[PDB]
Write an enzyme that holds these catalytic residues in place. Structure first.
Site, PDB file in Angstrom:
ATOM      1  N   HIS A  79       0.535  -1.157   0.034  1.00  0.00           N
ATOM      2  CA  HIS A  79       0.009  -0.020  -0.083  1.00  0.00           C
ATOM      3  C   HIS A  79       0.765   1.168  -0.110  1.00  0.00           C
ATOM      4  O   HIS A  79       0.997   1.799   0.924  1.00  0.00           O
ATOM      5  CB  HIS A  79      -0.994   0.017   1.138  1.00  0.00           C
ATOM      6  CG  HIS A  79      -2.017  -0.992   1.076  1.00  0.00           C
ATOM      7  ND1 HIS A  79      -1.878  -2.253   1.647  1.00  0.00           N
ATOM      8  CD2 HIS A  79      -3.113  -0.924   0.256  1.00  0.00           C
ATOM      9  CE1 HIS A  79      -3.351  -2.785   1.381  1.00  0.00           C
ATOM     10  NE2 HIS A  79      -3.915  -2.228   0.479  1.00  0.00           N
ATOM     11  N   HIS A  83       0.848   1.458  -5.919  1.00  0.00           N
ATOM     12  CA  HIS A  83      -0.594   0.698  -5.797  1.00  0.00           C
ATOM     13  C   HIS A  83      -1.273   1.921  -6.280  1.00  0.00           C
ATOM     14  O   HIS A  83      -2.417   1.634  -7.062  1.00  0.00           O
ATOM     15  CB  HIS A  83      -0.837   0.399  -4.302  1.00  0.00           C
ATOM     16  CG  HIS A  83      -2.371   0.018  -4.266  1.00  0.00           C
ATOM     17  ND1 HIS A  83      -2.807  -0.987  -5.133  1.00  0.00           N
ATOM     18  CD2 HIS A  83      -3.202   0.713  -3.567  1.00  0.00           C
ATOM     19  CE1 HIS A  83      -4.266  -0.802  -4.741  1.00  0.00           C
ATOM     20  NE2 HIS A  83      -4.457  -0.026  -3.711  1.00  0.00           N
ATOM     21  N   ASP A 230      -9.090  -0.662  -7.408  1.00  0.00           N
ATOM     22  CA  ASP A 230      -8.433  -0.930  -6.533  1.00  0.00           C
ATOM     23  C   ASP A 230      -7.797  -2.289  -6.341  1.00  0.00           C
ATOM     24  O   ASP A 230      -6.724  -2.765  -5.917  1.00  0.00           O
ATOM     25  CB  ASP A 230      -9.355  -0.745  -5.423  1.00  0.00           C
ATOM     26  CG  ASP A 230      -8.467  -0.637  -3.803  1.00  0.00           C
ATOM     27  OD1 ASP A 230      -7.132  -0.568  -3.592  1.00  0.00           O
ATOM     28  OD2 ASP A 230      -9.124  -0.586  -3.024  1.00  0.00           O
TER      29      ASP A 230
HETATM   30 MG   LIG Z   1      -7.436   1.100   1.009  1.00  0.00          MG
HETATM   31 ZN   LIG Z   2      -6.189   0.314  -2.271  1.00  0.00          ZN
END
Ligand SMILES: [Mg+2]
Ligand SMILES: [Zn+2]
Length: 311
Positions: A79, A83, A230
């Site tokens: 993260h 990303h 995502d």
């Molecule tokens: Mg998140």
């Molecule tokens: Zn994410």
């Protein structure tokens, strides 16, 4: 903040989307430097006509991109900026190659790109409990997308920082609408919300009742799209997905936040079946041109399952 980095980025030529390969769903950033990712991001804003439509000044967009990148933690294995950058790139490909762009308003596109880039700001790693110091120690189970509210807060702070105001050109009404969409877009990245709203989306589609003209349904679609982007590392070509799964595992176990490969195949198969496959199937129904995300997800399930059966 490297004034050198800004000067560098602001003065650089920005290659085409085609040259940068950002229109490809199979895009990878392993070979790119941070500067190259910043240039790709400029191209994303430019080709979606956001720079033109909202009169963004070059130096301001450059400064904002660098502030966003800086507010991700490089010591967090998965993260981090890469990303977010990849999430934004998938959004760009979905809008262009996926042909979703003509289905949305300019403000929704603007908000979705900003949200994709900002959705995990200041993430400290999945193995690190997010503590809400502003609430009682015994009453910290709001679970109302607490970490996501934090990511949005970080986003707004950067959008309002001196010399970083890329939304300065919007009228007050446009600004309020855009902030609202960004906020809902970032909160949509809480998987809990994805699971909670999955039902409608899947049902509506199952009965050819999905109407993008319905405000409620469009908001629902924007939430589903954010989730699709995502989670898009799961749709990447096999060598890339193995690497991405490796990063997540590291952040999870080796505390890459601030038994392994052996358990990764089973875990990825599980995640694909429980969360991913249905989402990309639903997205493909909305826009057939988004098929490569589904194809990629299916190909990875088979590769991981094979390894799970131990080769
Ligand atoms: Mg998140
Ligand atoms: Zn994410």
């Amino acid at each position: 903040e490297e004034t050198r980095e800004l000067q560098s980025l602001a003065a650089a030529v920005v290659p085409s989307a085609q040259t940068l390969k950002i229109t490809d769903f199979s895009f990878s950033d392993f070979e790119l430097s941070d500067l190259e990712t910043a240039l790709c991001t400029i191209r994303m804003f430019t080709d979606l006509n956001l720079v033109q439509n909202f009169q963004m000044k070059h130096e301001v967009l450059c400064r904002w991109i660098l502030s966003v990148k800086k507010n991700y933690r490089k010591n967090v294995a998965y993260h981090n900026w890469r990303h977010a950058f990849n999430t934004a790139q998938c959004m760009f490909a979905a809008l262009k190659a996926g042909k979703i762009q003509n289905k949305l308003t300019d403000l929704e596109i603007l908000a979705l790109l900003i949200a994709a880039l900002s959705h995990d700001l200041d993430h400290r790693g999945v193995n690190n409990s997010y503590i809400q110091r502003s609430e009682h120690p015994l009453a910290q189970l709001y679970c109302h997308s607490i970490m996501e509210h934090h990511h949005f807060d970080q986003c707004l702070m950067i959008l309002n920082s001196p010399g970083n105001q890329i939304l300065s050109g919007l009228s007050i009404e446009e600004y309020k609408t855009t902030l609202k969409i960004i906020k809902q877009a970032i909160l949509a990245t809480d998987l809990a919300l994805y699971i909670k709203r999955r039902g409608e989306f899947f049902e509506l589609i199952r009965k050819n009742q999905f109407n993008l003209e319905d405000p409620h349904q469009k908001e629902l679609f924007l939430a589903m799209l954010m989730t699709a982007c995502d989670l898009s590392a799961i749709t990447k070509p096999w060598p890339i997905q193995q690497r991405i799964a490796e990063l997540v595992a590291t952040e999870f176990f080796d505390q890459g936040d601030r038994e392994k490969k052996n358990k990764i195949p089973s875990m990825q198969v599980g995640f694909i079946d429980a969360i991913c496959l249905q989402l990309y199937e639903a997205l493909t129904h909305v826009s057939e041109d988004c098929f490569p995300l589904l194809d990629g997800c299916r190909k990875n399930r088979q590769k991981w399952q094979a390894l799970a059966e131990q080769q």
